[PDB]
Amino acid sequence: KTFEVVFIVLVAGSLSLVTIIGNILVMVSIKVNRHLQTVNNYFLFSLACADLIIGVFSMNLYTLYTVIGYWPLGPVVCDLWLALDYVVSNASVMNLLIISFDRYFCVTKPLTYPVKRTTKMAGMMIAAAWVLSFILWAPAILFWQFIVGVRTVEDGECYIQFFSNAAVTFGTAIAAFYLPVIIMTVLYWHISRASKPSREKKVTRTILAILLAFIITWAPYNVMVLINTFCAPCIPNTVWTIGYWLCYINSTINPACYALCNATFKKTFKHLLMC
């Protein structure tokens, strides 16, 4: 027990550290190297930002939550942290979605779309992602206690209240994960099937890496959210922790499946680390 806590804080802490370091490297490498400053990498920039926010704030506060056994910081910063976390995670997923769309359009109309698409459009789509994430999650999180008339959240624990009622739970969860993953998988299927063998094996390779990443990371919690919404004593806390962390690590593996999956990005990376 004396070495266990430090082991936990070391694993989780170092994980978060690797997250923020990696994404900082992405942003920095995109700003520093003009050659990779394409419109397709602006989405990677926004993604790196969201994953940075997740990497610094969500991971450490949830590490604290889990390592102490309860949430001491208070109801105000509880609602704040949860709002932030959900909004920026949803932002991350919407970013992945918008990347999927962009890649689809770049694939289908290979000569018209890349020229027709401008940076202003990219900024517009990014802003759309963040805004829609905020609207979908933030107002429902903080103002649920004001509407219900009580804060269902226990004094020691810090979860979201509206999951106590399934009607909103499903509606938000599918709009955050299920619908977006359906769209991503189907249009990526369009990409793979219509685009393309070295040229063709690789497409299925990258698409598979990306989709398997997104799924193995985001699916556990989203289905755990659906399980707990039916019965209260049904889900313990250890598996919950596992699910939450599994959701967090996506923001750690994002530079691998989008940035470092390309050849130049890593070569750029090396010089920053190699001074």
């Epitope: 050659h35 394409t38 890349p114 393309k196 070295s198 063709e200 690789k202 990005f265």
Partner: nanobody, 121 residues
């Protein structure tokens, strides 16, 4: 990184033909195979529209609706150099022709210097 230089730029009367060649320099790690290459013409004050594009690894040709039937594109995989031959040209095809290369999903995208092609009559 890599510079892409073009050739063949010159004068031609209506009905004649030309052969623009785009050569790409030596690249580190990335294989010429891993790059798809397209030709883009830029007319005075006009938007940089795409004429055609070729995937050397697959040999797949994708032409624009404007230059279909006249323009033919290929390459030499061993030489790492692409050739775009245009036939039966019009004075509407007076523009600066540049050579672009995009890695899949539009990372590592490159643009060249460009050569002038002016059609008389």
């Amino acid at each position: 990184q890599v510079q892409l230089q073009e050739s063949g730029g010159g004068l031609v009367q209506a009905g004649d033909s030309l052969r623009l060649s785009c050569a790409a320099s030596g690249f580190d790690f990335d294989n010429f195979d891993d790059y798809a290459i397209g030709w883009f013409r830029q007319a005075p004050g006009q938007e940089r529209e795409g004429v055609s594009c070729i995937d050397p690894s697959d040999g797949s040709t994708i032409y624009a609706d404007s230059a279909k039937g006249r323009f033919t594109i290929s390459s030499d995989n061993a030489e790492n150099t692409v050739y775009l031959q245009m036939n039966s040209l019009k004075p509407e095809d007076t523009a600066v022709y540049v050579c672009s290369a995009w890695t899949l999903f539009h990372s590592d995208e490159y643009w060249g210097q460009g050569t002038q092609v002016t059609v008389s009559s």
